Every structure is written in C-alpha cells, then in structure tokens.
C-alpha cells in the first residue's frame, strides 16, 4: 500500500524538479542545466 519504488515501465531516471523521465542517465544530468541556468527576477545569490 503506497510502496512505489516500482519501475514497472517508466525509466528509473526522472527529474525531481519538474517531472521528466529520460532513457539515459546522461540526459537527466544535462536537463538539469535548464534548472541551473536561469535569470530569476531579483538575483541575490546562487
């Protein structure tokens, strides 16, 4: 009941920031780039 952690189908690689599954570990790491490279109004730090 509510166990999850089951890769019945979806790839074991999914972005935990937006929600995107990729069929390549390298793809997931690359996508993150979009998350770590934006101009957030009022850039204080980061």
Interacting residue ranges for Zn ion, rule: CB under 5 A: 15, 17-18
Tokens of 36: 């770590």
- As a whole number of angstroms, the distance between CA 46 and CA 33 comes to 14
Looking at the Cβ atoms of 18 and 38, the one nearer to Zn ion is 18
CB-based contact 12:22 (threshold 8 Å): no
What minimum distance in Å lies between the beta carbon of 10 and Zn ion? 15
Instruction: Between 4 and 37, name the residue whose CB sits nearer to Zn ion.
Output: 37
Nearest to Zn ion of 18, 23 (CB atom)? 18
């Amino acid at each position: 009941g509510s166990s999850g952690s089951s890769g019945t189908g979806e790839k074991p690689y999914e972005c935990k920031e937006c929600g995107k599954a990729f069929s390549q570990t390298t793809h997931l790491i690359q996508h993150q780039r979009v998350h770590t490279g934006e101009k957030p109004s009022g850039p204080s730090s980061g």
